[PDB]
Amino acid sequence: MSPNGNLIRMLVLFFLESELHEHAAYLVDSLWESSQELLKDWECMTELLLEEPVEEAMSDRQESALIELMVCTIRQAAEAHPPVGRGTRVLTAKERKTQIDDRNKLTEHFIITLPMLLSKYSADAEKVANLLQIPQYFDLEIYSTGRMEKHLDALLKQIKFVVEKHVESDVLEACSKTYSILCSEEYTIQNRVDIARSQLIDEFVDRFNHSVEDLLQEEADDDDIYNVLSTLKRLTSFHNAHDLTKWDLFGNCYRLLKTGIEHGAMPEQIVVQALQCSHYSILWQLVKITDGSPSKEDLLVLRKTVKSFLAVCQQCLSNVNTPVKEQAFMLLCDLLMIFSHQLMTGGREGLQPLVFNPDTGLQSELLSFVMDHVFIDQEANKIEALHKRRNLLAAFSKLIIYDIVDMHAAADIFKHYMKYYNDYGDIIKETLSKT
Numbered sequence: 001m002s003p004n005g006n007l008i009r010m011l012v013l014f015f016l017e018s019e020l021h022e023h024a025a026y027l028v029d030s031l032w033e034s035s036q037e038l039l040k041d042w043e044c045m046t047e048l049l050l051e052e053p054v055e056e057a058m059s060d061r062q063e064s065a066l067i068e069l070m071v072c073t074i075r076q077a078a079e080a081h082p083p084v085g086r087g088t089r090v091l092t093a094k095e096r097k098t099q100i101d102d103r104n105k106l107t108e109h110f111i112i113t114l115p116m117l118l119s120k121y122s123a124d125a126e127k128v129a130n131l132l133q134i135p136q137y138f139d140l141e142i143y144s145t146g147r148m149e150k151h152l153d154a155l156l157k158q159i160k161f162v163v164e165k166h167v168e169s170d171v172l173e174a175c176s177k178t179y180s181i182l183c184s185e186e187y188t189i190q191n192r193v194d195i196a197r198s199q200l201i202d203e204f205v206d207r208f209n210h211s212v213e214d215l216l217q218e219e220a221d222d223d224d225i226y227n228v229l230s231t232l233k234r235l236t237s238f239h240n241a242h243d244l245t246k247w248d249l250f251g252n253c254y255r256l257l258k259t260g261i262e263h264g265a266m267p268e269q270i271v272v273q274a275l276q277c278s279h280y281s282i283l284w285q286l287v288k289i290t291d292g293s294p295s296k297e298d299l300l301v302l303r304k305t306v307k308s309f310l311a312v313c314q315q316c317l318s319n320v321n322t323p324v325k326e327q328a329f330m331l332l333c334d335l336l337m338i339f340s341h342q343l344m345t346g347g348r349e350g351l352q353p354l355v356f357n358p359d360t361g362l363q364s365e366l367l368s369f370v371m372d373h374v375f376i377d378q379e380a381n382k383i384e385a386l387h388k389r390r391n392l393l394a395a396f397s398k399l400i401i402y403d404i405v406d407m408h409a410a411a412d413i414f415k416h417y418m419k420y421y422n423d424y425g426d427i428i429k430e431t432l433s434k435t
């Protein structure tokens, strides 16, 4: 009770203090067979996290590590298998019984305590993002079963406060996914969550629209910039998993971008976010048009939107800020692949009016960016910046394979940059073998 308290407090200390386990997930997994009883004492953990001390308090770093370990135990209990990259998966009657009982315990416990955890740690971006990994493991039918409506209201309150207080992409994405899970995965609670979600979106679209209007009518203030960026960030996060097309966000993103090209003075993050949001609008417009039975004018309206946006992304390759170029480049390489002839697979030849062939100018600009921003002369930031350039090339590779860009001009560039491997590689290879 307080015994298990010491053992957990020390488990959190051994984790942080030794570099004998890099990953909380792997520490939890390794101890799982020997210490399941302890590692599922969630009452003990939430008590450590929520109580005020008598003596000796927990540090921010140990609080963070307990939350990260707690969430790892919640996963392992619910999935009843080792974590990704310790796998090898057929449960006994008693493992299956233990899994169901564990899912019941952690659901009842965290429906009650997760709102309290979010309240207390509301301002800490890393902690909140970790805590919001918990609902995915809930047996959500229990929100009805337990007359537990009061606690669903409480989580929704706390997600609203979190979304309202934060702009970090991890927090916002955690919030987006938590609404997604609450809605479409039990009818009983669907209607209540939909109401809270659309009210949250409503308040954010209003503040966004008023801020767009402020920024563009305006001399332009650092307040004007913050208001546009901050609200657009929230809406961009949600627009991936939530269909926000009912709110015409593409229209205002389009003005922000047109303004940024014309007068060349739109802050980089507003352009990047505006590009992402516009993209998510278009992808959702496309899904409604596939699944529907769309008319001629339906198709020709989505086309005008998509051609106007392809134009914007092209112009944005010329933006001074490389984060804009990369965003514009990534979207060009997605959209040119989606609105390719592929779109007329699975008996969907109705969509022909939506098909796009990039002109010469665009193909050449998509070649330039590869030469200038994938293949560059010159810690942790650099393994990350390299995986990105890999993804940019890989995205662009797909266009080459299906002849959407000039596949010869592309390989000419791959020649140029591989030369030293094709000129000296064998000699370098065998040299390095004998050392």
Ligand SMILES: Cc1c(C(=O)NCC2CCC2)cnn1C
Pocket: 421, 422, 423, 424, 425, 426
């Ligand atoms: C097999 C190989 C070579 C090679 O055969 N080099 C000779 C050619 C350069 C002009 C003639 C270089 N890189 N790798 C991988």
